[PDB]
Design a protein around this ligand. Structure first.
Ligand code: HEM
Ligand code: HEM
Ligand SMILES: Cc1cc(N)nc(COC[C@H](N)[C@H](C)OCc2cc(C)cc(N)n2)c1
Ligand SMILES: Cc1cc(N)nc(COC[C@H](N)[C@H](C)OCc2cc(C)cc(N)n2)c1
Ligand SMILES: C[C@H](O)[C@H](O)[C@H]1CNc2nc(N)[nH]c(=O)c2N1
Ligand SMILES: C[C@H](O)[C@H](O)[C@H]1CNc2nc(N)[nH]c(=O)c2N1
Ligand SMILES: [Zn+2]
Lengths: 405, 404
């Protein structure tokens, strides 16, 4: 057949061909000799202009004016601006389209059926760390919406030739502290040991609980970052209980409502937005399987298994599997009871299958990272497990970027 | 740049250098990764160079590289290729190459065992009838009354003139799939096509959910022939549950022996189109995939109803809860019938040890993360957090076309 990657769904026996991958302008880490698909993080002048043109072309297509006079005039404005200044600036509607396209383009995101529905707060006028803080509080307020979560991104000023970057130092707007103990263990979240100790070095007076919310470390151009405590009433949390295991509530477990990534770079048309925090709502397995059960995170599997009276001395009891299920169930139940938006891994992957279909017709493919899309418990019970996926980088994109310190 | 491989649970890093030894492309390019794809969409100097490479691999393994022995063997292979366009392996080389093919299989989580493989040389097979005898002896040996032992039986290689020796079945043991004129399937829907071939070639079909198929065996350029495996040869395990009494009432069962019979074994450029091999199961293959896949026996819902779960909503996690109990039934019943099996936690732990051995021994280990991480409880096992580099080394097991 066709000269494009053939893509098979083994459950349904159906076939598609990804033609969108031809649009990829950027190489990933794989070659004919070895697949590096599983690596988590594998290792301007005219350069700007050609990314800018590509982006402007994408914009005019999406509003159906390719080749139009408005299109050619915008192209000219952009080269003119790059010609005099070395850089250029997005119209408001170009930013909104680009931020949605970045999300639509994210191969690791299973919640992309939602991509068309994103509130884009334009904060390209921000000029201080105090002001970043107001913008961020406003984002959290809008996004949380007392539990009826709404997807959102707030975009701060782009990287500028020889000026410092806007950066949020924290990896998420909400994080729990990880306190290194004298015995070498960690109280709270071990994922956050470094950012915790940075908060302290910067004058935060540390708590000592398992679920202490971190302050934000916010850097405005060419300044040391400044510390800002989130008002407790802005951070919605959900205490965790199980629908039938009455003792589960006694564990004093909890998680926050709003997953908001704050340390990624949004690239649109060669422009780099180094601070552009975005948020959605949780898929339950991120909480109940990874955050609570990873051995290098809260690691609560054994404690829960002991409460359920399972045989933890032998793998073949499946004590780990049975505890994980209940922890995941408690997450779903507690969020549901609290009326905070959450999606379970079945409903999420089913909707991602629908997204794959929508995108097949719309664009002729969808870049997708199978290892991240398939949930971390019950993989083959979800339809995505059986679906081949082609992974490639399209721009606009969310990118990892080196920590500012 | 050789790839840096990181474990995200432990924070340790290694560098894969083994991949430099790869001489065959996989599906990926810098523009797109096709690692999740199940099947590859895709003269004498060629054969001669793989032959020398394999002979060198061999003498190196017995610590004898450079010896008169090594040198004269390279001369033999060269003299045989130059004259006939092909050559033949010595039995010790076959034995070494079969073990390496297994060591090199990126999709296999049970490679900790790679050195312990019984190799039956069946290259003096000249008829389907003889293939059947060898196959029977393999099953008998590998089954070993439930104390399962890894084995391979290697039939005669491909040859330029003629058709291949082939086992048409994908496994030595498979349950019939009977398509009901009204859409549905009775038995294993993965086996509809091979069931229909058997019937067409004169097999009297049954009407059960777990009817063991006969084997269709093909000697070169002959129609395949049909051979019923003696029931006492196929060990089966009735499935029951340690605490749920009604589970046994389901009538479920599964065969002891996983024996793959349609893959091509490639050693030193030579191709062995019929080289069935077997080990023992990991419980999730049966419990999760074979019983719970929607296009397989698909019993999730029946188990969920028997368990009295709320089936109306994904968010009760009824699927997850039934799957777990099903996997537990498999482990329990195999253990009760004293038949070798391994659960996915023990298997992935052993694979981590294998990665470490291989790093020390060879500087890397080819692994296909999507196939190594089990189909339930992925992130609960250590392999989920382990970066992996996938590439093709030879000797190798490969897919080959269906012979019909
Ligand atoms: C609407 C609800 C959403 C759901 C349920 C969701 C779901 C997910 C999940 C489960 C992951 C994997 C996370 C992990 O394992 O750490 C993910 C990754 C991601 N999603 Fe979403 N998503 C949502 C909204 C968003 C939004 C609004 C954006 C940005 C505008 C976004 C962009 C991303 C990106 C960039 C990643 C990759 C993160 C990384 O590489 O670390 N998603 N998504
Ligand atoms: C001793 C116990 C063994 C265990 C527990 C084991 C485990 C597994 C598992 C779980 C798979 C994935 C199968 C699937 O999802 O369909 C697999 C694939 C494989 N194993 Fe093993 N293995 C064992 C022995 C062997 C032996 C003896 C060989 C060959 C000599 C072998 C070669 C393979 C190959 C080639 C594959 C990939 C097959 C394919 O692509 O369809 N393994 N192994
Ligand atoms: C917007 C959104 C919604 C949702 N339901 N889930 C998310 C998940 O965010 C978690 C992030 N993927 C992870 C933790 O990013 C942090 C990170 C840090 C490092 C060092 C590497 C890496 N790959 N990722 C994001
Ligand atoms: C030796 C061995 C041990 C063990 N525990 N498990 C096995 C599993 O064998 C199952 C096979 N790998 C499955 C059926 O793959 C067959 C297959 C068929 C098709 C059409 C494509 C494909 N990639 N693979 C094999
Ligand atoms: C090694 C492996 O790439 C790594 O553990 C990945 C696997 N899949 C994942 N999938 C998601 N959604 N999130 C993750 O953090 C990871 N971790
Ligand atoms: C599309 C996807 O690669 C396919 O479903 C794979 C995923 N992982 C697998 N893993 C194993 N061990 N066996 C399988 O058959 C599969 N199927
Ligand atoms: Zn790849």
């Amino acid at each position: 057949g066709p000269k494009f990657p053939r893509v098979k769904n083994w459950e349904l026996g159906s076939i598609t061909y990804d033609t969108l991958c031809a649009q990829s302008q950027q190489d990933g880490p794989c070659t004919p000799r070895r697949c590096l698909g599983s690596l988590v993080l594998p290792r301007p002048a005219e350069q700007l202009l050609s990314q800018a043109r590509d982006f402007i072309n994408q914009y005019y297509s999406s509003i159906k004016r390719s080749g139009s006079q408005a299109h050619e005039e915008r192209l000219q404005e952009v080269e003119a601006e790059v010609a005099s200044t070395g850089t250029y600036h997005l119209r408001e509607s170009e930013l909104v389209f680009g931020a949605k396209q970045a999300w639509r383009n994210a191969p690791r995101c299973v919640g992309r059926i939602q991509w068309g529905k994103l509130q884009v707060f334009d904060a390209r006028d921000c000029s201080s760390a105090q002001e970043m803080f107001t913008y961020i509080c406003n984002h959290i307020k809008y996004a949380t919406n007392r539990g009826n979560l709404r997807s959102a991104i707030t975009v701060f000023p782009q990287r500028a030739p020889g000026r410092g970057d806007f950066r949020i130092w924290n990896s998420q707007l909400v994080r729990y502290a990880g306190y290194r103990q004298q015995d070498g263990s960690v109280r709270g979240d071990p994922a956050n040991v470094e950012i915790t100790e940075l908060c302290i070095q910067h004058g935060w007076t540390p708590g000592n609980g398992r679920f202490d919310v971190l302050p934000l470390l916010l850097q405005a151009p060419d300044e040391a970052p400044e510390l800002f405590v989130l008002p407790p009433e802005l951070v919605l949390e959900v205490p965790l209980e199980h629908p039938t295991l009455e003792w589960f509530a006694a564990l004093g477990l909890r998680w926050y409502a709003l997953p908001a990534v704050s340390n990624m770079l949004l690239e649109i048309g060669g422009l780099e937005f180094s601070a552009a925090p975005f948020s959605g709502w949780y898929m339950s397995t991120e909480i109940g399987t990874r955050n609570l059960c990873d051995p290098h995170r809260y690691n609560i599997l054994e404690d829960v298994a002991v409460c359920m009276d399972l045989d933890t001395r032998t793998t073949s009891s499946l004590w780990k599997d049975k505890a994980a299920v209940e922890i995941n169930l408690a997450v779903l139940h507690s969020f549901q009871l609290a009326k905070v938006t959450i999606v379970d891994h079945h409903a999420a992957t089913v909707s991602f299958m629908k997204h794959l279909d929508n995108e097949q017709k719309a664009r002729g493919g969808c870049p997708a990272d199978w290892a991240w899309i398939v949930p971390p418990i019950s993989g083959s019970l979800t339809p995505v497990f059986h679906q081949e996926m082609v992974n490639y980088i399209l721009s606009p994109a969310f990118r990892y970027q080196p920590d500012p310190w």
